[PDB]
Amino acid sequence: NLEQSLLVAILRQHFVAWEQESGTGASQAQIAIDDLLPQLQIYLGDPGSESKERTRLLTLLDQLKGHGLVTSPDAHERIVIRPIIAHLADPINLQALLAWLREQIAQQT
DNA sequence: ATATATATATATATATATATATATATATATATATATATATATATATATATATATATATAT
């Protein structure tokens, strides 16, 4: 669904950046929930509270964990991006969706 | 020539996620009910002071 596609796109881009700064496969990718929530709000809208944002993010993260794309939240509220994303099917479609989104976030308001 | 078989379209089923309504269960605050200390009523023994009265003194 749309939200899941956004989350995979975001994590794909951040993983790619991580491989730029660290090299490919040298170190596991990590990110904080507080760094993801702002972009989910940016690209989807406010559900009503920080608690609802966190609940939505947790549900999505569980869903991806089902596909083997993300680990569970850890003591730092951080998560690890599973390297399986490097072999995803159609990353260019993800880029197209991200461009569509950054166009909609502007046109809509 | 009749019938065969694959590619095509479409009607139906299956998977998955979101949200809502649900069932089981815990805990809470509420009300019924019981127990109690306490005061007040009913009954009683013992006795006094009393009203009614017998028995009675006194009277015509």
Closest among A13, A15, A19 to A99, alpha carbons compared: A13
Q: Experimental technique used?
A: cryo-EM
Calculate the angstrom distance between C1' of B24 and CA of A47.
Answer: 31
Contact between the CB of A9 and strand B at under 7 Å: no
DSSP string, A17-71: HHHHHH-TTSS-EEEEHHHHHHHHHHHH---SSHHHHHHHHHHHHHHHHHTTSB-
Contact between the CB of A48 and strand B at under 7 Å: no
Contact between the CB of A69 and strand B at under 7 Å: no
Contact between the CB of A59 and strand B at under 7 Å: yes
Calculate the angstrom distance between C1' of B6 and CA of A19.
Answer: 48
Query: Residue A85 burial by CB count (10 A; 0-12/13-18/19+): exposed, middle or buried?
Result: buried
Contacts of A71 (CB under 8 A, 6+ apart): A65, A79, A80, A82
